[PDB]
Amino acid sequence: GGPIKIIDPEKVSKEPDALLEGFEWATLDLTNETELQELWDLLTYHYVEDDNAMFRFRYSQSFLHWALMSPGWKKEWHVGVRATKSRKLVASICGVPTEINVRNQKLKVVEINFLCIHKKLRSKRLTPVLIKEITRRCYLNGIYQAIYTAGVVLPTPVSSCRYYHRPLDWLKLYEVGFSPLPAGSTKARQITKNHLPSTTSTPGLRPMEPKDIDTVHDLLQRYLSRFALNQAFTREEVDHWLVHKPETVKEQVVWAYVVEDPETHKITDFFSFYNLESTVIQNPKHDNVRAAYLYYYATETAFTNNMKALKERLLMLMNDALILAKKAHFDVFNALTLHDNPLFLEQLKFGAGDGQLHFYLYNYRTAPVPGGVNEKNLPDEKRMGGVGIVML
Ligand SMILES: CCCCCCCCCCCCCC(=O)SCCNC(=O)CCNC(=O)[C@H](O)C(C)(C)COP(=O)(O)OP(=O)(O)OC[C@H]1O[C@@H](n2cnc3c(N)ncnc32)[C@H](O)[C@@H]1OP(=O)(O)O
Numbered sequence: 001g002g003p004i005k006i007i008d009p010e011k012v013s014k015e016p017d018a019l020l021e022g023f024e025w026a027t028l029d030l031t032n033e034t035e036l037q038e039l040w041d042l043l044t045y046h047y048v049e050d051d052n053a054m055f056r057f058r059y060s061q062s063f064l065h066w067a068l069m070s071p072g073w074k075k076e077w078h079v080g081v082r083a084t085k086s087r088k089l090v091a092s093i094c095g096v097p098t099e100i101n102v103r104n105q106k107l108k109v110v111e112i113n114f115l116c117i118h119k120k121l122r123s124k125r126l127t128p129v130l131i132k133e134i135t136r137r138c139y140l141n142g143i144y145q146a147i148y149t150a151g152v153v154l155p156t157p158v159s160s161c162r163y164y165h166r167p168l169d170w171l172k173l174y175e176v177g178f179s180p181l182p183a184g185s186t187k188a189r190q191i192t193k194n195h196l197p198s199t200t201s202t203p204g205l206r207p208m209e210p211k212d213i214d215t216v217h218d219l220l221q222r223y224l225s226r227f228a229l230n231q232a233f234t235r236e237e238v239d240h241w242l243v244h245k246p247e248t249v250k251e252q253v254v255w256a257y258v259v260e261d262p263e264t265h266k267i268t269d270f271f272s273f274y275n276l277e278s279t280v281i282q283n284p285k286h287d288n289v290r291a292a293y294l295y296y297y298a299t300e301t302a303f304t305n306n307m308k309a310l311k312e313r314l315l316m317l318m319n320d321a322l323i324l325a326k327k328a329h330f331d332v333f334n335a336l337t338l339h340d341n342p343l344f345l346e347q348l349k350f351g352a353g354d355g356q357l358h359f360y361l362y363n364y365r366t367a368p369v370p371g372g373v374n375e376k377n378l379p380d381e382k383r384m385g386g387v388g389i390v391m392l
Pocket residue numbers: 046047048049110112113114115116117118121122123124125126127128131134135138139143144145146148149150151152154362
């Protein structure tokens with residue numbers, strides 16, 4: 001694989017294209033709490049909903065702060081559209097920089113996320129205008145490739161992964177309409193099926209600490225190298241994406257746990273998950289779902305290349321992740337079929353979701369990458385080794 005075209009730096013336009021009458025471009029400054037609030041107000045009412053209009057992602061302000069001001073970030077890549085008269089923010093598209101490995105070619109890219117148009121401005125073809133503009137701003141800073149995910153099918157996906165959902169509070173999920181009562185069954189029986197232990201089992205498991213950064217960095221990079229498409233983590237990115245900062249982050253978004261071997265005291269495993277709520281759009285009993293999403297993880301067991309041993313170790317580690325997520329009062333635990341996740345999803349009672357997430361590269365060609373599922377869209381241990389990046 002390789003780039004599709006080379007961008008002529010001499011010909012990148014210094015001025016943005018025109019917008020629909022009454023609207024104008026605005027760079028957002030997310031260090032300004034008022035502007036972070038504006039973006040949150042947009043996403044909270046206008047961002048991704050399920051096909052039944054029951055739920056809407058509810059990224060928190062703390063989450064947006066974390067997701068968008070990661071190492072190397074630039075305000076230029078936080079793009080808004082405002083109404084000229086009212087000044088109201090009516091659209092967004094955001095990028096942050098990172099490096100990816102694509103079949104062991106390292107690439108500098110932007111991750112594109114939080115593309116959003118106010119419902120009242122939909123179906124006006126503003127999307128290609130948003131895309132063209134953030135493209136321009138990236139080209140001006142020497143970035144010519146992107147990676148993104150979307151639930152919609154667009155030309156040439158690099159992979160596709162299915163969503164899986166592990167009930168933690170089954171009753172709540174039943175009450176909000178997410179989890180069914182299967183027919184011959186009862187509330188009690190579904191609660192029993194989803195019952196978790198009160199304590200974790202992996203010896204040496206503890207919360208990640210700043211002192212763990214270098215060793216988690218090394219382990220994660222070695223583990224991620226097992227995937228054709230992966231995120232090439234820097235130390236700063238380990239710090240930012242995995243180590244919660246309680247003194248300056250009042251609403252926690254990231255949880256990370258390491259396994260400190262009781263004998264050697266070396267870190268042999270780790271896992272992490274993040275907090276992303278969904279608004280329950282119309283329900284007298286509840287107005288949000290508190291979801292934990294599986295993020296990055298790694299284990300030394302992987303490198304023996306013994307599949308049964310890796311499956312065993314993940315079964316223990318990930319059940320512990322469910323236990324910890326429950327203790328932190330999450331309702332559900334979500335994962336995709338990427339990484340080695342097909343090894344444990346079904347046996348740990350993750351239910352198959354309706355959702356698929358498609359992965360795309362901009363201005364970069366490579367062969368399709370396995371996404372953890374077979375042609376029936378079911379988890380398959382022979383279709384891993386492909387997607388090693390998790391996007392928010
Ligand atoms: C080097 C740097 C490059 C950087 C950029 C790399 C590319 C990044 C690309 C973006 C990565 C975003 C990653 C995320 O954030 S994915 C999250 C997307 N956001 C949401 O789902 C929020 C709820 N929905 C909305 O806000 C709107 O419905 C959106 C804004 C999604 C579409 O608004 P609207 O419904 O009013 O549509 P339109 O009339 O303006 O435009 C119609 C055109 O737009 C194409 N469309 C529809 N949905 C998507 C989508 N999710 N990705 C890319 N394109 C999409 C569509 O096929 C059609 O194309 P075509 O008919 O011309 O073929």
